């Protein structure tokens, strides 16, 4: 029974990406202080308990599934696509998500608002003409008041419908005040859609759409994610636990049931 750890994660042989102040979901969305992680890849992503969000206040209804899906894919490779958004203002920003001295927003999302006095029914399409799966991240804005809803989006109630040939999701925003987070009682809910080769993305909204800017390239393989506060150092160990790497000469280990790599069995 392997009973000791160095207390440090060895940076070999696995490609470790230390999240430092960032969770994987904040890196995915493009929280400004997480933008250093754009297009990065990993065998093991390490999330720290000190990680924090510093952008528009949000929730992700299927958080654990999105996180697991991205972690297994092992890359944040992102490709901007030329969505056309006619009759709305793009690149909206907020003082809850500062970028430098000014207002800003998630780097991978596009806050659309009315242009002039109208917000048309958006209906845009994006075919997948590649041979890999595309991951689209999108959102829905929940205004804190009815006045805010009509000021931003004109329509008294919005709707976001995103579909492929084999899926559809319709989200109705929920208006009302929440407690202030970085000054704001409004919220965004984050959703996702996978588009298989030969399929197509359709986005249809008459308000409250937080648009995707492109897609993440999905991959398959051995990548994962782990929560750990262990420091990284320069050394070699094939087996990583949140407590640190451990020797793998023994059949069992009692360090942690969470492990990554060629590891002894937990007992």
């Amino acid at each position, epitope marked *: 029974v392997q009973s000791s750890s160095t207390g440090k994660i060895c940076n070999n042989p696995h490609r470790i990406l230390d999240g430092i102040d960032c969770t994987l979901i904040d890196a995915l969305l493009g929280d400004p202080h997480c933008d250093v992680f754009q297009n990065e890849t990993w065998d093991l992503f390490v999330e720290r308990s000190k990680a924090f969000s510093n952008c528009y206040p949000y929730d992700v209804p299927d958080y654990a599934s999105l996180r697991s899906l991205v972690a297994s894919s092992g890359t944040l490779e992102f490709i901007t696509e030329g969505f056309t958004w006619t009759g709305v203002t793009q690149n909206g920003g907020s003082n809850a998500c500062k970028r430098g001295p000014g207002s800003g927003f998630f780097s991978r999302l596009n806050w659309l608002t009315k242009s002039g006095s109208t917000y048309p029914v958006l209906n845009v399409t994006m075919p997948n003409n590649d041979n890999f799966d595309k991951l689209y991240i999108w959102g829905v804005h929940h205004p804190s008041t009815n006045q805010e809803q009509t000021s931003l989006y004109v329509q008294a109630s919005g709707r976001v419908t995103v579909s492929t040939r084999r899926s559809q999701q319709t989200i109705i925003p929920n208006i*009302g005040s929440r*407690p*202030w987070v*970085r000054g704001l*009682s409004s*919220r965004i809910s984050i959703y996702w859609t996978i588009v298989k080769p030969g399929d197509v993305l359709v986005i249809n909204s008459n308000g409250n759409l937080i648009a995707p800017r492109g897609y993440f390239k999905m991959r398959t393989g051995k990548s994962s994610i782990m929560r750990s506060d262990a420091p990284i150092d320069t050394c070699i160990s094939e087996c990583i636990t949140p407590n640190g790497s451990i020797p793998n000469d023994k059949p069992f280990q009692n360090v942690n049931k969470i492990t990554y790599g060629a590891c002894p069995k937990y007992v």
Partner: antibody
Amino acid sequence: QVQLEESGPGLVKPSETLSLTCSVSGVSVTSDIYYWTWIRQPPGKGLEWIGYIFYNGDTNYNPSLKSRVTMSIDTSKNEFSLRLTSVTAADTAVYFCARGTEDLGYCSSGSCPNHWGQGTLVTVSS
Amino acid sequence: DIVMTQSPSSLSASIGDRVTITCRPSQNIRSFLNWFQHKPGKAPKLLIYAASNLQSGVPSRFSGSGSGTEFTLTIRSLQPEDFATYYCQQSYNTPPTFGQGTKVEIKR
């Protein structure tokens, strides 16, 4: 944006049922995202959360009180209410009603009452 | 069932002074921690939500910090109107639970 006025007897006899009402002004109790909460504080003691109720029927009561407490929302009167059975002197307290907003990015469901009433004292005595 | 240990139970400080109140939950609660202020005869008021977010109308001399198992409410330059009892409140699992409170008194 909301006002919350509590009402109810003030004196309840031991073993009897305590009933309180919260009159809500400024929003509708039929809204999908708000929940309505009661909290209490015995004289000279700490605050104790009682429970929450959503218009859709979802409720959660403190296990210390769950086998004696119920809540309801009266949509017609724009009120919500507390019912606490088989009271003793331990239930003498200031009772506060409160509103919160479902916000699962930052809060457990129904767990962050952020607009409170000023409280009404209930004394359990013969 | 999470026990919130606030300290000190009471403190006195002069006008203009910096005041610090600590809260230590009985288990790690990440950032699911709120701070309430309760002035005599008024409704308890949420001051800080999710460990560090200032509520509307709250003066910027109030700030919340920390995460995990240790949280701090700071009042950076105490004013007479800040006389109140302050409570921490965890929103991490049910039932929500409160600290036993810190009574802040003004020295003059």
